[PDB]
Amino acid sequence: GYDRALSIFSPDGHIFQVEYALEAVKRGTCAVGVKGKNCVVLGCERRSTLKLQDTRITPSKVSKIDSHVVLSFSGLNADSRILIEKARVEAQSHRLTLEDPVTVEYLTRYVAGVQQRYTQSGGVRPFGVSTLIAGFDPRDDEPKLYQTEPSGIYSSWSAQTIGRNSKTVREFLEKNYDRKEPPATVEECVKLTVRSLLEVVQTGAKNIEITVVKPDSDIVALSSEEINQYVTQIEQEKQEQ
């Protein structure tokens, strides 16, 4: 019975609840994504460490929607769980009726669809979540990366980041990413991604996690040491200069 209109216009023409919802995304731990010639990479900052937490079981920022698509987010963790569940269902329902998994643009659209319905339905507030959704369409090699906001607006990106200090790292990438010369290798790509975060992280491989998505449902999460080979390399490369 509770349908009070929580998301509403104000004289200037804004819906303050959608904006306060972005304010919550700017609070979140940074998230970034970049696509190479033949791969897509996702990076994510994580507070400190922390010397007394348990990492194996505790929710890791990158989630799998299907075997060929993943999702990353900044903002309210509790909220993102809701978008991940719904998204994972629409994935398997798509398979069940269309006999083909989702395209990255289709899934991305569905999520942004939810995000929007919560800016226009009564008794509910928008999601304090913005996302990077990345993968490969089935029987396709060309890489895909998309971003969705609490507005319900979505769009594709060669590189993008969201969350705290996102502005710094977008400015970094706006300089360090050539549309004509996109990171030809996995390695070449994972490097740029580790570096984009190293403006905002304040330590090496402790906070950074990387997930590498390559065609035909090929996804792997780099374990700290491999990330620390890019960290070891980046601090001495900048040095010489």
Binding site: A5, F9, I15, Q116, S156
Partner: protein, 238 residues
């Protein structure tokens, strides 16, 4: 605070008026009608270079004989297209014929005032406007402006968004009873080039038409690119 479907003392709906304010902030979009077709064009406005400039669709197909361009909180327009597309296909199914463009528009507009607290589950009005352009065999080529106020108007040409008054004025002057399709294509391009902050090019602008002949087509970045350099040359000489 004070209710959603509340009236001001001037007899306006605060929300519908505050909705229109959100539209003024939207990307520009122009539409021009002719005896040869209707042309719609838009300003993509990519907030960063990195953003893949063609995943920005502000012109969509509603049916083979109807297209529509949008301005403002574009996210809100998803529901409206979905309904418009359904409405048009449904009608085809019940009558084995195309829906008249007015009818299609009037259906979209109904949707717009269904908000509040029939069975109007929707908390606020849409925060987006639509130019709707198509062709039926009764009233040939047509353009409509569909506000979140539920009202629509037919236009021989019209702009919505950031540069609308400057472009409407410029449209008032430039539009004549007998422009060709290609003249109209150019005025859209010209008038967009005036009001857009950026230097109009094939990646921050898109152009489309709807002819009785081939229905609704969105001009690919190549074809529009040639029309831009067709302007620079048409303008250069006087």
């Amino acid at each position: 605070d004070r209710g959603v479907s509340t009236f001001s003392p001037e007899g306006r709906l605060f929300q519908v008026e505050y909705s229109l304010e959100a539209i003024k902030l939207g990307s520009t979009a122009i539409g021009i009608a002719t005896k040869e077709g209707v042309v719609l064009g838009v300003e993509k406005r990519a907030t960063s270079p990195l953003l893949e400039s063609d995943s920005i669709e502000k012109i969509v197909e509603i049916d083979r004989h109807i297209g529509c361009a949008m301005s403002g909180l574009t996210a809100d327009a998803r529901s409206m297209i979905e309904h418009a597309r359904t409405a048009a296909v449904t009608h085809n199914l019940y009558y084995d014929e195309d829906i008249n463009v007015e009818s299609l528009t009037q259906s979209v507009c109904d949707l717009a005032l269904r908000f509040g607290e029939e069975e109007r589950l929707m908390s606020r009005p849409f925060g987006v406007a639509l130019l709707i352009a198509g062709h039926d065999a009764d009233d040939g080529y047509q353009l409509f402006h569909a506000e979140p106020s539920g009202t629509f108007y037919r236009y021989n040409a019209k702009a919505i968004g950031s540069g609308s008054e400057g472009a409407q004025a410029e449209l008032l002057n430039e539009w004549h009873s007998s422009l060709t399709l290609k003249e109209a294509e150019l005025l859209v391009l010209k008038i967009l080039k005036q009001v857009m902050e950026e230097k109009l090019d094939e990646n921050n602008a898109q152009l489309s038409c709807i002819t009785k002949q081939d229905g609704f087509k969105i001009y690919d970045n190549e074809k529009t690119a040639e029309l831009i350099k067709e302007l620079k040359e048409k303008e250069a000489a006087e």
